[PDB]
Specification:
mainly beta; homodimer; Structural Genomics; 5 strands; structural genomics, unknown function; Desulfitobacterium Hafniense; PSI-2; YabP family
Amino acid sequence: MDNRQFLSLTGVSKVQSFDPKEILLETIQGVLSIKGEKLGIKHLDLKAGQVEVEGLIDALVYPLEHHHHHH
Amino acid sequence: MDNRQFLSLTGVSKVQSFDPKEILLETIQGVLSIKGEKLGIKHLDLKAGQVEVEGLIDALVYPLEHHHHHH
């Protein structure tokens, strides 16, 4: 069991921020905030529109539903 | 068009709860809460410490530990 995780996600259309400690990827229905450290490796070309990163990802944050909730 | 995104994570030591709308994985920094629609696993997952899920994800919940981070 290693501490580095390899994260692969599809639906990535627009890159709004890329830092090895915080990455903002604009995906199909939301923007993903990838927080951690040593988040190396990036898809420079959106071949299948997917991202594949390696490092110590501490938190994965997707946007909460636009208010709504039904509650 | 399909709106399903493929989310793959390595370093998954244990699974907490498995529901096709909400996946709970016990990993390095804590429990990763995957929320969405049709959250099915790609194959024989959990094995090898890797989990691939496909579906129309709504949001991701990953706690910044209780280990600082919050600033």
